[PDB]
Structure formats: C-alpha cells, structure tokens
Amino acid sequence: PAVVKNPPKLALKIDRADVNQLPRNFRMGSDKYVGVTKTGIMPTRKGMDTMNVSASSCFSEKELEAILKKVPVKPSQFYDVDLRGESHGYLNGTAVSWFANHDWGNDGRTEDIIIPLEKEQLASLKGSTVKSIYRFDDKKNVILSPVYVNYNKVRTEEEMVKQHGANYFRLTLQDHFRPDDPDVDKFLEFYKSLPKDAWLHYHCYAGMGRTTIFMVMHDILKNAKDVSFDDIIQRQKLIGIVDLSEIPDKKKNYGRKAYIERYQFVQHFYDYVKENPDLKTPYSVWAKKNKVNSWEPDYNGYIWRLDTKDRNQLPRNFRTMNSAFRTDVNVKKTGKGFTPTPTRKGLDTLYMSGSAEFSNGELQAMLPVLKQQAKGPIYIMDLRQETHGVFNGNAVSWYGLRDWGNLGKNKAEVLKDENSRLNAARGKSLIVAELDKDKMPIDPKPVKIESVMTEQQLVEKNGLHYYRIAATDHIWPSAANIDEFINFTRTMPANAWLHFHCQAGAGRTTAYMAMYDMMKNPDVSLGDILSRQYLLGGNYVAYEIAKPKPDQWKADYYHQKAHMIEKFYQYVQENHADGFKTSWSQWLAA
Amino acid sequence: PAVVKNPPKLALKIDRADVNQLPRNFRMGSDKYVGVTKTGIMPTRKGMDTMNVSASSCFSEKELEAILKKVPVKPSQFYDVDLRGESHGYLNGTAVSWFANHDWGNDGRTEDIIIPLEKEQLASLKGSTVKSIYRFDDKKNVILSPVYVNYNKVRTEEEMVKQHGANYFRLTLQDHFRPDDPDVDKFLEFYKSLPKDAWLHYHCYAGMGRTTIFMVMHDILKNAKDVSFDDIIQRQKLIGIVDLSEIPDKKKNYGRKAYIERYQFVQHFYDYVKENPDLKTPYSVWAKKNKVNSWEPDYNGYIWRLDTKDRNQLPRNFRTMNSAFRTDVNVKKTGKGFTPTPTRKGLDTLYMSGSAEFSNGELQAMLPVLKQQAKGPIYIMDLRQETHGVFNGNAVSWYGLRDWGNLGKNKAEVLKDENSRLNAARGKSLIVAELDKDKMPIDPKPVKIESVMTEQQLVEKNGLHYYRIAATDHIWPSAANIDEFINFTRTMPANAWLHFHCQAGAGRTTAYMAMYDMMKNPDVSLGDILSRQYLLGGNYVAYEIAKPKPDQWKADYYHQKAHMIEKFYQYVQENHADGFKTSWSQWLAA
C-alpha cells in the first residue's frame, strides 16, 4: 500500500487485523529476562511471579482470545485496562481507531467528552456493512491508502471484552505523555477495589509507552517496599522493551521533555507508594503536598461579577411565545434544520417566556408583561449552577474560570455555597465588576454592599414562584438535570407559566425552552421548534462552529448540544404518548 | 515583503534593523501598571522601586544606545544579560541570527559548543562586504524574502556591547523552555558576584518568554521574603505582558507542557529563594534534595569495560613514522586538504608512533619494534582521562556514558580515582565486559581479579618511560591539555621517541600526533600533515559528518576538531620561531 499524500485531520484506520495469535509486544509479569542491563548485572526477580499481570499492544478480537487462553485465569478474573485516549472500537473483530498526527485524535479533550464522542463515531458506522478504511504503517506512523472492509458488528472495546466474560476499565490517556494526577487517582481507586485474585492486562496502541508506565506502576504497587526503584525499572525493560530511565540522543526539544517527565513521574509514584503503603491519602493530594503535582485548571470563583445593573426595563433577550420574530437574523449562527418560517403552532397554548438574568428593576418591569399574558401560576426557572444573587438590587454572581465555579457540586452543595457567600458579603466593601470580552474586570472599584438576597427571595417577595436547576454554563444540560425538569412538569399547577433564564438567556435558557416546547408539541418538527426558539430570541440549539480555531474551547460542547438536542426530540417522540413514564435517563440506556 | 516557500534548515536573517529608539517591549521594574488583574485587585508595588532592572527584545546597536542613554546609570554599571541560546551577532549596527524552525538553531547544544560555534559563524561573514540576508515576520515567526545588506564590521553581542562601555553576560537558553538547573546555578553565581549598584537588563528575542522568566526570578531574588509569589507573578504581568500563571486554551500537547513547566519552575525558584535567603546552597543541590530538580545525564562510570584482551601481537592501529601508508584508504573519511600523496619531509626523524590501548602481551610485541627504530629514550604518552588499568594482563577501563567517567576532574583527581578503583577491585570477583555497538555488555560473566596494576606500573616495569595527559574522550584536547603537552616536549631529551595512545588509537591519538608533527615541521602544510597522519594509520583530524542524523551527537565535536586543528597550525606558524614563548592558551586569548 502507498502512503496517503493528503491525509485528512482525522482518519479512520485499521489498528489490528483479526488474527489468531498473541498480540504484538505481549508479555507477562513472570516472563524471563531477555537481554542485559548496562552493568551486566541482572536485577532481582523478587515479587515478579505473583504480580498477576500481562501487557501488550492493542488487540483484535481473535488476539484477545489468545490472551484469555494463555493467561492462567478465567475471564471473570481478567481485567482489560484500556489506556488509549484516542477513539477506537471494533468492526467485527478488526480493531480500528480515528488517527490524527502523533496519535492525538482527542488532544486536550476530557474524559466526559471523549467517551461520548467515541460512542458517536462508532455509532456513525452502524447501519452499514461496508466502509472505506485507511491502512496504517507502524514504523513510520503514517496512514496508508484505504481498502473496503465488510462487517456487521460495531462494538466499543468494552462491549467486545465483556462479551468474552472478562472485565473492562478505561483511562483516556493522550499518547506520548505521563498520566495526570487525576487519572492516577482514578486508576488507584479502581485498583484498590479489585478482588485480590484479579489479573490486570495493560495495553495502549503499540504496547510500549503508556503501557510501560503502567507496568512499572503495577510493579511499584506490588513490590516497592521490597525492591528498589532502579531494579523495578530495569526488570520491566528486560521483560518488555522500554527502559524508562533512558533519554536517547534521538530525542530532542519537545519529545525529550516528555521522556524526562514520564521518567520523573514513575519516580514520584514510587516515592508515593513507599511513603503510603495503605494508599489511603490520594496520589494527587500527596503530590500536591510535596510539590510534585501535575497542573490542573482551577474553576473556583475568584470575583463577584455584575451580571446586570439595576435598571427599569425588561432584561436582555427577553421574549414570550407571543413575541414577534427577530429582525437581526443571521443564518451563520443557525444550523441543521433552520427555516426562516417555522409553523408557530401551539405557541399560544405554550405558556413560556425566557431572558437573561435580571436585577430588581428588570423584574418589576417583567411582572406587568407576564401578568397580562399568563393564565396561571407564574414560575421563574433559574437554570444557573453558578452561585448568584442580588447585591443592592443588582444581579451578581461568583465567577470562576469559564463560569464554572460550582462544577461538580450537587444541588444542595450549590445552595449551601450560594447562601454562604452571599451572606459573607453582606455589609463588606467588595469589588463587583462587569467583565469585558476577555473576562477581565472593567474599571473595578470596591463598593459597600448594603443589601443582599438570593434570587429566590427577590422572586417570592414579588409574588412569583421559583424553581432552581443547577445546570453548568456552556454545556448540554445533564441527564439528572433534564429529568429534574420533566419531573417538575408532572406536578406543576394547571396553567403554569414558565419563565426560563440563565446568565445571558442564550445557552441553557434556550435549550430548556426548546425541550419544553417539544414536550408540549410533539407534532411540530425538530427543525421548526429550534427555528422558532431562535427566531423568538434565543440562539440556535443545534449551532456548531464552522472552522474550529485553536482557542475555541466551546467547539466540542456545541457539537455535544447539536447531537443531544436531536436525541431529546426522539425521546419525546417515543415517550410523550405514555406521558413520559420512561424517564430520559432510563431511555438513554438504549 | 513575502514569505519563503522553502527556507534552508538554518537561515541567516535580520533580527533588528538599526534604528534610533528604545527596542520593543522595553520596560523597567519601576514602570507603572498597565491593565488589571483578573480579581480586579492590584498587587503591592513593594520593592519594585529599587530593583534596578530593565528588559526588552533583542536590540540593534542604536537601540542599545537609546537604552544606555535612558537608564539611570553609566555604561560601567550596566549589565546586558543575553539569554539567547540561538547564534546571533551584528553586521555593523544590525542584529542578525541564524534561525531554524521554532528558533532552535542550536537545539540541544551545550554552552561549550555554542559560544565558539557562534564565533565561527560570525567569522565566516568577515571578509565579505555584501550579504543577502532573509527578512523575518515577528508576528508569525517565518522567514521572509531576502534583502542585500552591506557592512564593514562583524561583531558578537559581547564585542558590540563592551565597545559602548557596558558589561555582558550570556546564558545560552533554548527558546520556549525554562532554564535548566545548571543554568540557574550559573546565573546565581553571576548575580552573587555583582557590585550593588549594578543595572541588569534582560533580553531574549521578543522580550517575553525567556525574558519574563528572568524578570520574575529577579523580582523573587529582591523581594521574595516581602512579596507573595502570586503578587510578583501578577505585578510582572502589569509592567510586562506575559502572565506566567496563565495556561491558554490555544496551547496544546507539547506547547502546553512547556508553559506549565516554566510556571512550576518559577514556583520552585520562589521556594528556594524563600528558604535560602543567603543563596548558600546551590539551586541544583537544593532542587535535587527536594526532588524538583531538572534532569541531567550521569556520565559516571558504572561497568569495567574490557578494552583489549591480553594477546601477543602489535596493538590495534599500531604505527610508526617509518610505516607504510594504508591500503584501505577511504576518501569519505577524509576532509579539507586530503592529498593522497603528502610529503615525507621530517618524518624519518620525528620519532613518533601511536596505537590503541594495549594489554601486557601487546606491549611486549611493541618493545622490539620500538627499541629497534628508536635513537633515544621511549615515552609512552597515555592520553586517557578515563580511569583505566590492567586486570590479569588485560587492559580495562571504568566506563561511564560516552566514556566520560572522569569528566570535569583535574589530573590529580583522575589519578586519585584511578588508584582507588583499580586497587579496590583487586582480589574481588566482578564483571569485565566487552561492549557492543550500543555500548551494552556482550555475554557479561563475573571474573576473579588476581593481578591488578596501572598502565604506569606496566610500562615502567618494562623499562619505558610514562607520561599522562587526561584528555577527555571524543573531543578536541583542552587548551590546558595541549599546553601540558608543549611543556613536556620542552623538557624532554632531544632524541626522545613518543608513543601516543588512547583507547582506540584514533581520536585523541591522531590529534596529538598531528600536533607534534606540526611543531617539529612548521614547513609542511596542514593538509600534508593531516593526510600523512591519516595514511599512516590514524584518522583524518579534520573529518566532519556529511548528513548528520539526530542520534549522532558526535557531529558537533568533529566539527570542533576540524576547526581547532587549523587554529593550532596558525599557532605553530606564528610561534615556532622563539620556541613557543607564548603558550597555546595565551595565544588562543586574542
């Protein structure tokens, strides 16, 4: 096969053809030493025979059978530890994956985006039994001219391994680098919970880098108290093929730094198991305490942001289902299915409005407009996970990088944080600033906080009702959050009017309005729903970034929304009849 | 101007046209804040007043004048701290440099190779008066279309600066990376040695990256006990541009790691200054102690290598100045001036021979041949810096990476180490192995060491005289080692026969034989001497690698030999008259 001259950014290619044999670089913790150390003295073998571990490059289905046959245990005691962060899966028994230069197909992505993206990429292959798939050169690490592959099974590595009665565990590690502290913590949690008779098999693509890191971690976990670090490093070289302490002249600049960083990492890991036999205190906490921690971003709040100043007029992006379509249309900000002329039916019976956050004056201005249109209990649906409130009549919020100050907290932890911080601000002199295009404060100056109340106190004091859903800014609403919404609609009053809002009244606000709209009008088309919600004043829920520039971190999140809003529409179609007896979370299990 | 579609690997380009003005990104530790921090809160300015520091991008000669005229001190209290590792210089008042992708013109070179390489690169321009010099786009860091530059003077940044009465200090740092621990030590030593009214000006190419790192170090050094780490990081951004704590979304994989590594480095530097206000413990020592040290190779010996087995025959590459030229001559192994038919003038009376190391048996076979051609006392000149000796009749050495086991040691320390290790091995049983092409031991098996002696004891026991020069393997002999040799020849008998040897009989051996040949025969040209010495069985001293692969670390050292051998020649021509009154070191300094 010839080398592809103009390879695409991301190309699906063959990893391993289905062959009956042990996979490349297969090896066991009890194998004999091959070759010699630089001194010519063999390192001790102490503890090697009882580690119950193997490792290899990635494997085709038939190669996995050979492994299961070969290892001295039953599939139920076998755990496949999948270390690849790049997207991969199986066409029948053939292993495949999406390749980008340096095997950085999912470069910079987090696990919560990688696992779902991969599921989708594999899903896009189902429903066909023939596909053009590039070939690959292992030594030159480049893609080669394609060949058609016939198949009738598309599986993730987990589905495939489970179907042979074995276990599975994934880590989405970028090729060429040591794992970050959070992944080490995730791995140690998995390892601490295993049955004492478990057999771990590590693999990545080639079977050397990442896999050697983990074979050394395993060895350290089993024998650090009895064997030295240098002996562990050398014996893993002798039964595998990589010596982690080796920094070759071949490696320069960037590459060289990654080799050094991975070698220092296993040294820190060694020192960790050595000073913490019980693995009680987390690796990340230990590393942090000893200043050898890896870097992670911090999303915690650091500044009171002014969301909107008290003024007497409607809030930004305000709209009702009885509002006129917009004038400032821009098709470049729309997406799949946007017609400039949606049906607009069911809208008058849809008692729903939406807007950006509101201050005290903006809320006064809304009451008359809503009272005149409403025909039942009016609810303000606050969709903000971030801590926010009211300072001297102005809407403020505790802002952290990416507005993710409460990421990871449950609803109750959010409320406790919210009540706590707002209170701690009462009466003090604090900076409350508006943020510019780059999120830096504008002409910040301290100000005395006279009054402080939650948005709920402000809403109820004005005779409206209130319901909080702590949805994270910039992302598709979580499964639990969408269900908390559907549940709420089960028991809500008769002709309840729902006014949705987040920080700007675009992202979360429009996604929920669109979903509510679909629930009440399963006769309208997904395209019409999304189009009307955008024409009214929200954004286009299915919008995607055309040409993703480097600094556009939202790209994958927009894509995730585009995909899930359509999955929601299909949930409404198959479950509204029942009255949604099947919850969205349950339905997702299909 | 326009971008070049295919620039040469290394391309000479313009850094700064000569203009009368402050250089870009010029700033002073006393400047005022511009912009805000993310919290809206400004960091204290404590100590920023008395740092006596400035920074900027690289500058043209006129821009240096603008700086000197601008700072509040006289040229004599001014220190230009040049952080550029890339080769740079001046054509008249215009700054120029040799550019390679990512500005890694000298990627992986040590300061010992760089400073002289740069001097030779700049010298290569001397003589000519016109040069087509590529232009350069700062915003995209790409080589643009060439212009014709006319100059009458070529200078190093050091020569240009001192001519303006200022002081100069260089650190050869690679762009994009934090400084390594040994470079930090070298900086701390420079720093500790300064008068207290010194003005330090830092610059790299753009005035950011490397420069920001040292602006932050400088601040830390002057105010660590009074200002927090976070404040120094923020206030340095307010007067400069770059915020070191910022890891931007646009930085991925390799790039992102570098940003992180530099930010962690200034944090460790901060802890170090905090804990060592007196800067007594070197940074590297402290870093190793705390396990936050940067990685460096270990050249220490670790295995007894079998240099040459006790056999009865002349040693490898044996040869005399009465010998017959080689039959297997290879021109790909020669170089500038290789006549395949060089003179013979002054040879029959040079009284010189050479060869690889030798064991007991090979010395024996050598005596008869020498004692027959020698018309005076025979001296064995052992040119090995590495610790070696004789085990059970076999020539062995204590081999460390690159055979640099005694790197950085003086003659006395080398002999002390040699006696210690050789004696320590007597009686014991251990590995003495021969090495393969990868320097790994071939079939390592322990052996009992019955007898042990130094090469000196072996030589003197056989009635020959012994002299030792500790020359480092693979490189051009040091100025001190060359002078130690000249001095020896001035005190030896006029009929003395010198037999040089190293471990292979090629590198060090031929360079010294060639230098001696030139000293006795100032009449014959370099080419004759070098070819003559190659034909006789040595190697070509001016040999260079044609298409050097990334794994051939020796390329730059061969280049250095080819350059210094010619310089030595010019030393003879100008000093053979008075009998070398001025030493090679003294001359070199000119």
PDB file of N, CA and C in Angstrom, chain A residues 394-450:
ATOM      1  N   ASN A 394     -28.810  44.821  42.313  1.00  0.00           N
ATOM      2  CA  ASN A 394     -28.078  44.387  41.127  1.00  0.00           C
ATOM      3  C   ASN A 394     -27.840  42.867  41.144  1.00  0.00           C
ATOM      4  N   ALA A 395     -27.982  42.239  39.994  1.00  0.00           N
ATOM      5  CA  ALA A 395     -27.750  40.815  39.912  1.00  0.00           C
ATOM      6  C   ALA A 395     -26.246  40.535  39.831  1.00  0.00           C
ATOM      7  N   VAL A 396     -25.695  39.822  40.822  1.00  0.00           N
ATOM      8  CA  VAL A 396     -24.292  39.469  40.823  1.00  0.00           C
ATOM      9  C   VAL A 396     -24.099  37.939  40.838  1.00  0.00           C
ATOM     10  N   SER A 397     -22.875  37.480  40.575  1.00  0.00           N
ATOM     11  CA  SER A 397     -22.545  36.054  40.558  1.00  0.00           C
ATOM     12  C   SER A 397     -21.067  35.859  40.899  1.00  0.00           C
ATOM     13  N   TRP A 398     -20.759  34.745  41.558  1.00  0.00           N
ATOM     14  CA  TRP A 398     -19.386  34.428  41.925  1.00  0.00           C
ATOM     15  C   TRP A 398     -18.785  33.739  40.708  1.00  0.00           C
ATOM     16  N   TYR A 399     -17.871  34.439  40.065  1.00  0.00           N
ATOM     17  CA  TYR A 399     -17.317  33.975  38.814  1.00  0.00           C
ATOM     18  C   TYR A 399     -15.973  33.255  38.907  1.00  0.00           C
ATOM     19  N   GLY A 400     -15.934  32.073  38.289  1.00  0.00           N
ATOM     20  CA  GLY A 400     -14.708  31.300  38.235  1.00  0.00           C
ATOM     21  C   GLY A 400     -14.405  31.117  36.751  1.00  0.00           C
ATOM     22  N   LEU A 401     -13.184  30.681  36.419  1.00  0.00           N
ATOM     23  CA  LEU A 401     -12.818  30.440  35.022  1.00  0.00           C
ATOM     24  C   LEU A 401     -13.972  29.733  34.316  1.00  0.00           C
ATOM     25  N   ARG A 402     -14.266  30.135  33.076  1.00  0.00           N
ATOM     26  CA  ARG A 402     -15.354  29.545  32.292  1.00  0.00           C
ATOM     27  C   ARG A 402     -16.718  29.587  33.012  1.00  0.00           C
ATOM     28  N   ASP A 403     -16.865  30.428  34.030  1.00  0.00           N
ATOM     29  CA  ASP A 403     -18.124  30.495  34.778  1.00  0.00           C
ATOM     30  C   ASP A 403     -18.491  29.118  35.345  1.00  0.00           C
ATOM     31  N   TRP A 404     -17.477  28.336  35.689  1.00  0.00           N
ATOM     32  CA  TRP A 404     -17.693  27.001  36.237  1.00  0.00           C
ATOM     33  C   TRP A 404     -17.397  26.946  37.726  1.00  0.00           C
ATOM     34  N   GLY A 405     -17.777  27.977  38.468  1.00  0.00           N
ATOM     35  CA  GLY A 405     -17.477  27.979  39.896  1.00  0.00           C
ATOM     36  C   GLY A 405     -18.071  26.860  40.733  1.00  0.00           C
ATOM     37  N   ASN A 406     -19.164  26.247  40.290  1.00  0.00           N
ATOM     38  CA  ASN A 406     -19.748  25.176  41.103  1.00  0.00           C
ATOM     39  C   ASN A 406     -19.711  23.817  40.398  1.00  0.00           C
ATOM     40  N   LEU A 407     -18.871  23.698  39.376  1.00  0.00           N
ATOM     41  CA  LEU A 407     -18.748  22.443  38.650  1.00  0.00           C
ATOM     42  C   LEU A 407     -18.472  21.282  39.617  1.00  0.00           C
ATOM     43  N   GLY A 408     -19.227  20.195  39.462  1.00  0.00           N
ATOM     44  CA  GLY A 408     -19.035  19.029  40.310  1.00  0.00           C
ATOM     45  C   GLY A 408     -19.857  19.002  41.586  1.00  0.00           C
ATOM     46  N   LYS A 409     -20.441  20.130  41.967  1.00  0.00           N
ATOM     47  CA  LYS A 409     -21.257  20.160  43.169  1.00  0.00           C
ATOM     48  C   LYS A 409     -22.674  19.680  42.872  1.00  0.00           C
ATOM     49  N   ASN A 410     -23.344  19.107  43.879  1.00  0.00           N
ATOM     50  CA  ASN A 410     -24.730  18.683  43.706  1.00  0.00           C
ATOM     51  C   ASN A 410     -25.615  19.876  44.019  1.00  0.00           C
ATOM     52  N   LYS A 411     -26.918  19.765  43.796  1.00  0.00           N
ATOM     53  CA  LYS A 411     -27.779  20.919  44.034  1.00  0.00           C
ATOM     54  C   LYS A 411     -27.654  21.460  45.452  1.00  0.00           C
ATOM     55  N   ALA A 412     -27.675  20.576  46.444  1.00  0.00           N
ATOM     56  CA  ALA A 412     -27.592  21.024  47.830  1.00  0.00           C
ATOM     57  C   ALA A 412     -26.262  21.715  48.144  1.00  0.00           C
ATOM     58  N   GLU A 413     -25.162  21.268  47.540  1.00  0.00           N
ATOM     59  CA  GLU A 413     -23.884  21.916  47.808  1.00  0.00           C
ATOM     60  C   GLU A 413     -23.864  23.325  47.198  1.00  0.00           C
ATOM     61  N   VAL A 414     -24.541  23.500  46.060  1.00  0.00           N
ATOM     62  CA  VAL A 414     -24.640  24.786  45.386  1.00  0.00           C
ATOM     63  C   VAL A 414     -25.380  25.764  46.277  1.00  0.00           C
ATOM     64  N   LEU A 415     -26.579  25.383  46.706  1.00  0.00           N
ATOM     65  CA  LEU A 415     -27.365  26.243  47.588  1.00  0.00           C
ATOM     66  C   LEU A 415     -26.585  26.607  48.859  1.00  0.00           C
ATOM     67  N   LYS A 416     -25.868  25.650  49.439  1.00  0.00           N
ATOM     68  CA  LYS A 416     -25.113  25.948  50.640  1.00  0.00           C
ATOM     69  C   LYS A 416     -23.995  26.939  50.328  1.00  0.00           C
ATOM     70  N   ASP A 417     -23.382  26.797  49.158  1.00  0.00           N
ATOM     71  CA  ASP A 417     -22.319  27.709  48.768  1.00  0.00           C
ATOM     72  C   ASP A 417     -22.919  29.113  48.533  1.00  0.00           C
ATOM     73  N   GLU A 418     -24.011  29.147  47.777  1.00  0.00           N
ATOM     74  CA  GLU A 418     -24.720  30.376  47.451  1.00  0.00           C
ATOM     75  C   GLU A 418     -25.118  31.141  48.712  1.00  0.00           C
ATOM     76  N   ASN A 419     -25.824  30.488  49.623  1.00  0.00           N
ATOM     77  CA  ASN A 419     -26.246  31.174  50.833  1.00  0.00           C
ATOM     78  C   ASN A 419     -25.069  31.668  51.654  1.00  0.00           C
ATOM     79  N   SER A 420     -24.029  30.852  51.714  1.00  0.00           N
ATOM     80  CA  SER A 420     -22.849  31.180  52.494  1.00  0.00           C
ATOM     81  C   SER A 420     -22.096  32.427  51.971  1.00  0.00           C
ATOM     82  N   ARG A 421     -21.789  32.445  50.680  1.00  0.00           N
ATOM     83  CA  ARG A 421     -21.043  33.553  50.106  1.00  0.00           C
ATOM     84  C   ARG A 421     -21.852  34.835  50.082  1.00  0.00           C
ATOM     85  N   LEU A 422     -23.091  34.764  49.633  1.00  0.00           N
ATOM     86  CA  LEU A 422     -23.899  35.972  49.633  1.00  0.00           C
ATOM     87  C   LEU A 422     -23.908  36.564  51.045  1.00  0.00           C
ATOM     88  N   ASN A 423     -24.144  35.726  52.058  1.00  0.00           N
ATOM     89  CA  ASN A 423     -24.142  36.231  53.427  1.00  0.00           C
ATOM     90  C   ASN A 423     -22.809  36.867  53.786  1.00  0.00           C
ATOM     91  N   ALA A 424     -21.725  36.138  53.575  1.00  0.00           N
ATOM     92  CA  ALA A 424     -20.406  36.657  53.901  1.00  0.00           C
ATOM     93  C   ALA A 424     -20.124  38.011  53.230  1.00  0.00           C
ATOM     94  N   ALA A 425     -20.923  38.389  52.236  1.00  0.00           N
ATOM     95  CA  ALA A 425     -20.710  39.657  51.539  1.00  0.00           C
ATOM     96  C   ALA A 425     -21.517  40.789  52.160  1.00  0.00           C
ATOM     97  N   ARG A 426     -22.608  40.443  52.824  1.00  0.00           N
ATOM     98  CA  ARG A 426     -23.447  41.465  53.421  1.00  0.00           C
ATOM     99  C   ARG A 426     -22.643  42.493  54.221  1.00  0.00           C
ATOM    100  N   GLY A 427     -22.725  43.755  53.799  1.00  0.00           N
ATOM    101  CA  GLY A 427     -22.060  44.835  54.513  1.00  0.00           C
ATOM    102  C   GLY A 427     -20.598  45.137  54.250  1.00  0.00           C
ATOM    103  N   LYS A 428     -19.886  44.240  53.579  1.00  0.00           N
ATOM    104  CA  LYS A 428     -18.478  44.480  53.319  1.00  0.00           C
ATOM    105  C   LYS A 428     -18.245  45.381  52.096  1.00  0.00           C
ATOM    106  N   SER A 429     -16.987  45.763  51.886  1.00  0.00           N
ATOM    107  CA  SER A 429     -16.602  46.577  50.737  1.00  0.00           C
ATOM    108  C   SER A 429     -15.906  45.671  49.728  1.00  0.00           C
ATOM    109  N   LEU A 430     -16.623  45.334  48.664  1.00  0.00           N
ATOM    110  CA  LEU A 430     -16.118  44.394  47.686  1.00  0.00           C
ATOM    111  C   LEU A 430     -16.149  44.875  46.251  1.00  0.00           C
ATOM    112  N   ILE A 431     -15.256  44.298  45.463  1.00  0.00           N
ATOM    113  CA  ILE A 431     -15.225  44.611  44.055  1.00  0.00           C
ATOM    114  C   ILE A 431     -16.337  43.838  43.366  1.00  0.00           C
ATOM    115  N   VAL A 432     -17.205  44.551  42.676  1.00  0.00           N
ATOM    116  CA  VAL A 432     -18.264  43.930  41.918  1.00  0.00           C
ATOM    117  C   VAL A 432     -18.132  44.502  40.535  1.00  0.00           C
ATOM    118  N   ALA A 433     -17.622  43.736  39.586  1.00  0.00           N
ATOM    119  CA  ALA A 433     -17.374  44.336  38.288  1.00  0.00           C
ATOM    120  C   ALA A 433     -17.984  43.655  37.108  1.00  0.00           C
ATOM    121  N   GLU A 434     -18.191  44.447  36.063  1.00  0.00           N
ATOM    122  CA  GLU A 434     -18.655  43.922  34.800  1.00  0.00           C
ATOM    123  C   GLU A 434     -17.401  43.376  34.086  1.00  0.00           C
ATOM    124  N   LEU A 435     -17.537  42.272  33.357  1.00  0.00           N
ATOM    125  CA  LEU A 435     -16.392  41.684  32.668  1.00  0.00           C
ATOM    126  C   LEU A 435     -16.416  42.012  31.185  1.00  0.00           C
ATOM    127  N   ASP A 436     -15.243  42.224  30.607  1.00  0.00           N
ATOM    128  CA  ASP A 436     -15.148  42.546  29.187  1.00  0.00           C
ATOM    129  C   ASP A 436     -15.131  41.291  28.345  1.00  0.00           C
ATOM    130  N   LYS A 437     -14.886  41.460  27.047  1.00  0.00           N
ATOM    131  CA  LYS A 437     -14.832  40.355  26.091  1.00  0.00           C
ATOM    132  C   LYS A 437     -13.865  39.229  26.525  1.00  0.00           C
ATOM    133  N   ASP A 438     -12.802  39.578  27.250  1.00  0.00           N
ATOM    134  CA  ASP A 438     -11.813  38.599  27.703  1.00  0.00           C
ATOM    135  C   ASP A 438     -12.021  38.158  29.159  1.00  0.00           C
ATOM    136  N   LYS A 439     -13.145  38.539  29.758  1.00  0.00           N
ATOM    137  CA  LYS A 439     -13.472  38.171  31.134  1.00  0.00           C
ATOM    138  C   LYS A 439     -12.616  38.875  32.192  1.00  0.00           C
ATOM    139  N   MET A 440     -11.978  39.976  31.835  1.00  0.00           N
ATOM    140  CA  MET A 440     -11.220  40.741  32.815  1.00  0.00           C
ATOM    141  C   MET A 440     -12.136  41.862  33.320  1.00  0.00           C
ATOM    142  N   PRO A 441     -12.036  42.236  34.600  1.00  0.00           N
ATOM    143  CA  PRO A 441     -12.920  43.298  35.092  1.00  0.00           C
ATOM    144  C   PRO A 441     -12.761  44.658  34.445  1.00  0.00           C
ATOM    145  N   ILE A 442     -13.868  45.388  34.352  1.00  0.00           N
ATOM    146  CA  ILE A 442     -13.855  46.731  33.771  1.00  0.00           C
ATOM    147  C   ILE A 442     -13.912  47.791  34.873  1.00  0.00           C
ATOM    148  N   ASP A 443     -12.927  48.695  34.851  1.00  0.00           N
ATOM    149  CA  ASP A 443     -12.817  49.794  35.807  1.00  0.00           C
ATOM    150  C   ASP A 443     -13.356  49.375  37.172  1.00  0.00           C
ATOM    151  N   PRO A 444     -12.758  48.328  37.767  1.00  0.00           N
ATOM    152  CA  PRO A 444     -13.179  47.822  39.074  1.00  0.00           C
ATOM    153  C   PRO A 444     -12.842  48.766  40.214  1.00  0.00           C
ATOM    154  N   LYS A 445     -13.799  48.939  41.119  1.00  0.00           N
ATOM    155  CA  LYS A 445     -13.670  49.779  42.312  1.00  0.00           C
ATOM    156  C   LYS A 445     -14.510  49.145  43.413  1.00  0.00           C
ATOM    157  N   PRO A 446     -14.009  49.097  44.658  1.00  0.00           N
ATOM    158  CA  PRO A 446     -14.778  48.491  45.763  1.00  0.00           C
ATOM    159  C   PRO A 446     -16.099  49.219  45.991  1.00  0.00           C
ATOM    160  N   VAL A 447     -17.094  48.507  46.512  1.00  0.00           N
ATOM    161  CA  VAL A 447     -18.384  49.118  46.779  1.00  0.00           C
ATOM    162  C   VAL A 447     -19.019  48.490  47.995  1.00  0.00           C
ATOM    163  N   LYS A 448     -19.688  49.305  48.810  1.00  0.00           N
ATOM    164  CA  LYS A 448     -20.340  48.796  50.013  1.00  0.00           C
ATOM    165  C   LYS A 448     -21.631  48.068  49.658  1.00  0.00           C
ATOM    166  N   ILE A 449     -21.719  46.831  50.107  1.00  0.00           N
ATOM    167  CA  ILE A 449     -22.886  46.018  49.857  1.00  0.00           C
ATOM    168  C   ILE A 449     -23.906  46.302  50.940  1.00  0.00           C
ATOM    169  N   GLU A 450     -24.940  47.066  50.599  1.00  0.00           N
ATOM    170  CA  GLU A 450     -25.962  47.421  51.583  1.00  0.00           C
ATOM    171  C   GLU A 450     -26.922  46.268  51.819  1.00  0.00           C
TER     172      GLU A 450
END
